[PDB]
Amino acid sequence: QLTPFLILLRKTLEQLQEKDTGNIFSEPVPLSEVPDYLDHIKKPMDFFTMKQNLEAYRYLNFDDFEEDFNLIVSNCLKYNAKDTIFYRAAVRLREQGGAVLRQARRQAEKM
Ligand SMILES: CCc1ccc(S(=O)(=O)Nc2cc3c(cc2OC)n(C)c(=O)n3C)cc1
């Protein structure tokens, strides 16, 4: 059965994906194209992996959800040079996504 909290996480995940207009963060960074990625990044994350986590009841709280979103952004800032589309997109996502999360955390607190 559905819970209000899990419904809120689903809603919030959709709102975050809407902010990623180019679908830069929809799926894992492809190791075939970026063969040194795991040399630098210890815990890859992306929205499809978050959707999998959400549906396996691994976000028992909001914190753990926000932490995975923040990894999407921090991994991208860490890996990519500043003068890239990826780095700029992660800065934009940090800005827009942070605002989605702040509002969503307020709703979570009422539960
Ligand atoms: C902007 C043109 C471009 C898109 C995808 C690629 S990719 O085939 O290398 N895929 C890819 C790489 C990513 C990436 C996302 C990618 O596919 C969308 N992110 C978030 C990231 O940090 N890296 C290094 C390369 C260039």
Resolution (A): 1.5
- 């990894």: which residue's tokens? 71
Q: Degrees (nearest 5) of the Cα angle 83, 88, 94?
A: 145
If you ran DSSP here, which 8-state letter would residue 28 be given? P
* Structure determination technique employed: X-ray
Q: What is the DSSP-derived secondary structure letter of residue 41?
A: -
Fold type of domain 1-111: Histone Acetyltransferase; Chain A (1.20.920)
The DSSP secondary structure of 63-89, one letter per residue, reads HHHHHHHHHHHHHHHHHS-SSSHHHHH
Does any ligand 1 atom lie closer than 6 A to the CB of residue 24? yes
Asked whether the beta carbons of 70 and 27 are under 8 A apart, the reply is no
CA-atom Rg of the chain in angstroms: 14
CA distance 50 to 42: 16
Q: What does the DSSP 8-state code read for residue 30?
A: P
- Please, which residues have CB within 8 angstroms of residue 63's CB and are 6 or more apart in sequence? none
Q: Closest residue (by CA) to atom 16 of ligand 1? A: 29
The residue ranges of every structural domain in the chain are: 1-111
